[PDB]
Design a protein around this ligand. Sequence first.
Ligand SMILES: Nc1ncnc2c1ncn2[C@@H]1O[C@H](COP(=O)(O)OP(=O)(O)OP(=O)(O)O)[C@@H](O)[C@H]1O
Ligand SMILES: [Ca+2]
Ligand SMILES: [Ca+2]
Lengths: 377, 283, 170, 138, 342, 139, 398, 166
Amino acid sequence: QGRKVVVCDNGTGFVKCGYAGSNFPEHIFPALVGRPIIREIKDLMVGDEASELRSMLEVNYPMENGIVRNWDDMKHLWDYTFGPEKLNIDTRNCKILLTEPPMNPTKNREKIVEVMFETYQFSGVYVAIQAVLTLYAQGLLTGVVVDSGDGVTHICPVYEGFSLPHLTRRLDIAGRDITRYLIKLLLLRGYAFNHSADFETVRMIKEKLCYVGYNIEQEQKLALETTVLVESYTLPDGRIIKVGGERFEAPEALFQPHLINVEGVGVAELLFNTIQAADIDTRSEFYKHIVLSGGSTMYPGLPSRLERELKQLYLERVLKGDVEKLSKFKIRIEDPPRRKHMVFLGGAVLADIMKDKDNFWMTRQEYQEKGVRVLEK
Amino acid sequence: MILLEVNNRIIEETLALKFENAAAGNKPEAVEVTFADFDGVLYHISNPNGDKTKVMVSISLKFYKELQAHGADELLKRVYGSYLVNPESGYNVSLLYDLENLPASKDSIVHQAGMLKRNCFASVFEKYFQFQEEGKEGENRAVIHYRDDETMYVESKKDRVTVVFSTVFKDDDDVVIGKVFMQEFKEGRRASHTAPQVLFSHREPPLELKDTDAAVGDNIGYITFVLFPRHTNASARDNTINLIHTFRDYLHYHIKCSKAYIHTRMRAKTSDFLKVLNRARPD
Amino acid sequence: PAYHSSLMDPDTKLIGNMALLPIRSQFKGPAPREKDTDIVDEAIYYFKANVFFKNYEIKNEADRTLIYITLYISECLKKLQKCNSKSQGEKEMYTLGITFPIPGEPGFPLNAIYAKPNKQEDEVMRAYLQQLRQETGLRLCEKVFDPQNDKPSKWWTCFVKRQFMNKSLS
Amino acid sequence: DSLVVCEVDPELKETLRKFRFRKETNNAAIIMKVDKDRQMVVLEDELQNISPEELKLELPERQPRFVVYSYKYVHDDGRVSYPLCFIFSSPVGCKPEQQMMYAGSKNRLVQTAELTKVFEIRTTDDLTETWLKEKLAF
Amino acid sequence: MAYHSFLVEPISCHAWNKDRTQIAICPNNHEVHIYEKSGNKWVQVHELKEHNGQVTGIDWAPDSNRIVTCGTDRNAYVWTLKGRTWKPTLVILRINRAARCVRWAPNEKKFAVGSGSRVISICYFEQENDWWVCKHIKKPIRSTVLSLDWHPNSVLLAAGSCDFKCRIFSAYIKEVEERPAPTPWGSKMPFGELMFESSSSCGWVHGVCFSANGSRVAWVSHDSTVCLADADKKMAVATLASETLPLLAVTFITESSLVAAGHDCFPVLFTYDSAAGKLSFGGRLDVPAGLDSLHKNSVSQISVLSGGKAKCSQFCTTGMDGGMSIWDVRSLESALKDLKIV
Amino acid sequence: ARFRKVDVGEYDENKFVDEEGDGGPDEGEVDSCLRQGNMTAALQAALKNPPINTKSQAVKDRAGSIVLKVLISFKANDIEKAVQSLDKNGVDLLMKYIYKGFESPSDNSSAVLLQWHEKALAAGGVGSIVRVLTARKTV
Amino acid sequence: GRLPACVVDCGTGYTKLGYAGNTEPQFIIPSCIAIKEMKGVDDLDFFIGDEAIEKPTYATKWPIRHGIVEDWDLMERFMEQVIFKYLRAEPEDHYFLLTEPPLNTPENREYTAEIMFESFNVPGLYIAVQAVLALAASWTSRQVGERTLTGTVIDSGDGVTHVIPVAEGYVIGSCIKHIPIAGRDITYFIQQLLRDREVGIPPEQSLETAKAVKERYSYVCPDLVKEFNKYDTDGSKWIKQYTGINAISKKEFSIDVGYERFLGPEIFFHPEFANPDFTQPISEVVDEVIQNCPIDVRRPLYKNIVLSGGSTMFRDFGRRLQRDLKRTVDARLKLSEELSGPKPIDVQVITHHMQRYAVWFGGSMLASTPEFYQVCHTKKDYEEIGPSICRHNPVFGV
Amino acid sequence: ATLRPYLSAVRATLQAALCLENFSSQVVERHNKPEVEVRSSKELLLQPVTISRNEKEKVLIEGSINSVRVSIAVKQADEIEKILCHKFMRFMMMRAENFFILRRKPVEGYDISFLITNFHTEQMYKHKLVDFVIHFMEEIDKEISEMKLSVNARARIVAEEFLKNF
Ligand SMILES: Nc1ncnc2c1ncn2[C@@H]1O[C@H](COP(=O)(O)OP(=O)(O)OP(=O)(O)O)[C@@H](O)[C@H]1O
Ligand SMILES: [Ca+2]
Ligand SMILES: [Ca+2]
């Protein structure tokens, strides 16, 4: 009219969708599309249903590392989000805002606009860059967005509204890889877990109990000299296990990639190295506009550890050791409480404040008239 | 089990089984067995050339050449005679038993089979027991390196026969426990007025074994058994040899067993503390 | 799993929810004329196996007839155990026929699974179960007794204490 | 890239016009606000004779604001400029919705005003004369 | 002597509604339970599940009937009763360490949150944005803030911290209230101004409280002392060293009498003799696991149920034993006849 | 480099530091009471002017030795009267000196100290011990 | 180095012990210990194995219940005599290989290691998972083709019957299922059938006879009724005779052995025969476990179903399982055709010569190799790093 | 002889030391640590104190706002008592997950150390914990005396059992 907007952050792990002006995502569920192997099971299962019966379906993720790989399964996943079991909407009477992940090819960028108008026939569509949304959501145009989610962790320089492809770097370590590593650690503790079979059970142990150490030598002294880290955890089958130092050793992979045989430096050293390769004047402005987003930034102690680690780097390899000049080192790593789904939260606010505007939403009028795209950047 | 057994169980059950099956006329069973005893001993029971009617029992000691020097071969010739054959490649002494041709009383040969290691050691004692008996004083002492880093010194005198063990305690806690056990051997004739005398020294050797290279150490100790004619004569000869040569392992056996009992105490009290703690909860 | 009746014919009438299967008997009753194999032969051939099983899915009406005979076979063995001749076993298998409750009455401890009988269904059910009891008892007498001589065989008497589905007509 | 969440008020257009060619040579500032119901960037205040510290105190600590500051910059050489500094005060604790309307409207306002010296602060405490001069050195 | 065991783990904090029909508690976790009384029985009516860590402070604004909570997850929520359900509104405290305590002001126009950020957050509602704003009182606080209590004027604010100090600050927020009239504490009360600071250089300050008319502040430290300053006597500090274990909570019950509780697990009375300028130990109020006190573990909080801090007739204590006790001061005066209040 | 080991928390401006080695007991004072047999006076002398405010360890040890000498010289039954002579603040101070005495035990100075601790505790309560642990400037 | 490692498999019923390198254990003794009904050396007054079962004045105690150690005091004393009486190993000169049940807690691993290192001073220790040792023992009959540590293991002994899926030497603990049918339950059910039918067996030797019928005469049949039919039709050819010796009078006694021959092992496939609280046939339990495991490991698990333990020694056990399991999987996989629109699932139950002592044999072969000394935890590490190291014993051998 | 006054002292010191509360880290975001172990916030550490019975037996008590560390020097009359003590403390430390309050390694130069957090004083009665530590100190002295007599006793028997056979 009036209405009705909608929003969609298609994660690699999880789909977060809701409505413009939502304060939480009204639906969160795994970005999943399982086909059955044998004969209320249907010909296909999506999200919650598909995760529930995962030991009976050959399951596919159409999102690999934030990019779409399978447009066929991606259609089924979009049918599920819009279809009764979640949003129950007539796409044809709705505007929709989507998010685009870092370094997405324009081939994909197009194909979705094509998909949205051709196969679903939305009256309005918009495509926002994640890193820019998460910054706009906080009154910022320049700055560096650390998005650590399920599949991959991206460090995203943005300047006065434009993302910078050629300073945007990835760390191939995030949520799935930490859950995977925690399994290995519980294995060495003497619990016969399986990387495949018990991934979901251990993911929940990770979410519930893991944290990032501030000073690893001190966390290891605690691990080794006391039992204060040790926690019982009751598994689905009833068995109780003890989780201790592995609580902080697992997320430590983010800072020390080699711990799971991964080439690279680890999020803090990466962040430092990236900020340092920019203009002297914009360096200042980046260091005081670091922003966290995504699920894997929720580990207790993470923002403190990043602060500490950046200071150690700047001191050793920029101030060359003298601590007298450390005091001058302005630095801001803002960690909002709602940072788990900032891309959605930002898109929900923007799609709301921009709902009844006209030049903003790319229309079906426009795309038929034509064509893909229909982009106005 | 307080006293360690002298006989080898694996030798006896292997042979008793085999000989019981021969005496029924059952089909001869194939056998290949590689096992050990105390003091670095390695046994091997087998069928030579695949011949399953013949059962060879071989033994290998790294210090056999030293025992051989003190009449091991002639003692073994007495005991086994026909049964004793040329040593298997790598081993020092081999017995051969024909399943087609066995004695009536099976128990006699099987008992002596199980005492192969013991009978290897026995020669060096019988030698020095009769030096003392006949009064041949001032002979050379024997030096048997029964372990790599442990040594037994046997020495014949006017009236007595001394046997010195120079044993080692790997674990440092075992030194302190062993010290307490040895102390009771030193004050040990409170029990038996007629028993042998037992002397102990913690680091340095006695006045006797000083020197010709007796290793001094913090983790070494010298146990000395002063045996007399009553213990070394023909009537009580075999009993004495059976005890004396198992002594080292009897000592270490009991140190380890002693520590295992300490464990059951520690489990008790630890279990009690945990109950007392748990009673500090509202429930 | 357990053994079911494979004589389920397209044109088989019922009695309650049991199948009114024919039998080749000399005892008079409401059974159809019966070639070689019938439900009583099937029950005896299967008995020694089925009696151990506790669970049993009912595939069709013919199985409810198979169950009943199986249960009764155990009632014969209890009585045959004490006998001193194949002739005396026949006296008491006559008596064991003449002597039990039906679907509906105090069990018959299976009232959950079987269906109740009106006048016509009731008098015919009494008589069909009777004809099964009399013919099963007769055939068992031949099978149970050893001809060297006239004692019951321990190979049938060893089953006496075992109960089919932990149910019993006594 | 192409976002003008709020447009620029025609009246405000002018104020920035006149201020761009201002004849006065003291330190002066225009402060600007986003009107929620109108959805346009508007004038809040105009202030004359202000040091950087004094401007700091005029700004809301917990609401975003746009500022255009005519500051007499004495260079390292000694000779003088009156650069038109644009300052985006964007405090941290502010309503997400409000931050989005400011963030989305900044670029439209900056080209509309035709300014090239563009700065942004997370806290008013950062707005000092050392800070302003540090940035202008570029 | 009216003990009720809500649970067996601690009650971290509690708050009562206006008419004391309902009590909110945190049963040593991330949630707040509200129990309404029904005849003899306490009955749970609500669960407030939004925090993602232990809740450390709860306060109930009596007239507006709004609960504020603060927890170790660094957040604070203002809870608003919508129909049958308390719905939460997230407040951006902008603090980087756990929240520790929270108290509405008397005027109910703003609340204060002490934290481990070495800072007090003063939050008020901004009517135009429909948004909770909050300003910080930073210096000279050098450690965690463990306790707060407002002056009756809703402007002066006392605080106890792990840097061993009781302080009085001005939390004057010009955008919500009239400027305050001068106090014995001072005339200049801009936001953040330090009106008073204690001279004790040891002992963590666990509880602090203003007097009924606000002239006097009293606090308790971990060196087993209780202290009081009255601004009428030029902020002179009366001190008393206890023979027993530290106190954790304190409140005025008259203008010159205090009730305090801590690790001994029972309430104790202190009288202040205005003339002689000294604090005096009025004795134990709780008179008969193995413990002889009602509470079987440290008492962590104590609150005035009726009569306010001028003529308190009933007071509440919650403790680490999961117990809540109601104390009627008239009943206590019947039992211990040689017991003198004021 | 392993930049991770360098303890950057050392240079945090917010971190707490204790406020204040500014300007003991008297030897001859105590020995005048000690030769005379007036043990209670000897005790009250050693509890004068404790070196709480100096950072010099030496002057604190000087004081400890002097207080310990008084406590050793006592006979068991005489202790109780000397402790009851002290005001609450003297008793709390005695605790501090007793707990320091425990750190230097021999000559059955340890046996007598435990008895001193017993009377001190009766006099000052557990709170006298609490103020030992709580104190930031001590003996 | 010079002399071989010691190898001990401790089970509910029987402990198998001997030196590595050997094909069979040097002793297979009952896992019991006889003790007094206290100071001095009364802890040492005990006996184990056979010399402990009927000892006049001693109480026989069974320290291992359902695979798992209950009493550590008694387990430790049991070890004393294993090492010093039977093996006669100077424990300081030998690395040891001990086995752990499938559900063995990591705390148990520490308690085990504590005994071996603190009491017996062993220079090295390796706690092996039994399922992995059985898999290795079956490599003797694969043979070089697909010798892998991925497969489903049926360990069936005296105490407990488990079904244990393994993936590259790592057990999939979440999908382990156990069956209340084991050796002792079969012996008990066979003993039952004999009392019902046979006489002349002296009550004292009722188990003895039942065991002997079980081990020497029993087999798995293809179909029940057809077997009952063979026995009633033929009789003379299927009813075997067993004669034992009366232990008191020393004269022979003899009995018919009939239906229990096939009925005894049948309870694996129809547990309801002797078990009120369990009904699911072993074929279904194996299918269910494998279906609970990850997609991409099921086909490997299906084609390498290895048998371990004494209660798998029944004739035709493997063939029976394979058939019943292939009937379930093919019947199910035919509907997927008739409801559409799958590669024929290859099922293989492995029977091999080393089954009776599968675990121990595998352990003996592992301890013979050079790499065993490289994956063993040393005493030096036990002391310097601490007991934590024994919670994970590295898998190897492929 | 001088045990009872020494325990009475250690008790009262523990009674003052175990006055704890829950405390979120002011150093690390959303963290919670026993401040006596990490020691990163100096205002939260209480003065360490020792109680000593003589030159060989003492207790050191280290308090903090949310955690206490009691460390114990045990009587060890001779070498056999030393090694029994070490074997025994080591045994209980291996089991330190079952003792919720026992520290996996002792403070340097002590035999055994307890670390009682505010979480223990919250879920157990603090006066019972104090009782336990005094109880513990008594019983490990008894148990070492038992074990010392036990070893002496079985040494006698083993010496006679060997020698009586010659
Ligand atoms: N509280 C938590 N603490 C730690 N990790 C968490 C928490 N909650 C979720 N995660 C992890 O974070 C990931 C989910 O984050 P998010 O939903 O941002 O990822 P995504 O958007 O699906 O993937 P991507 O960001 O790669 O597109 C999961 O891997 C999950 O295990
Ligand atoms: Ca994402
Ligand atoms: Ca086994």
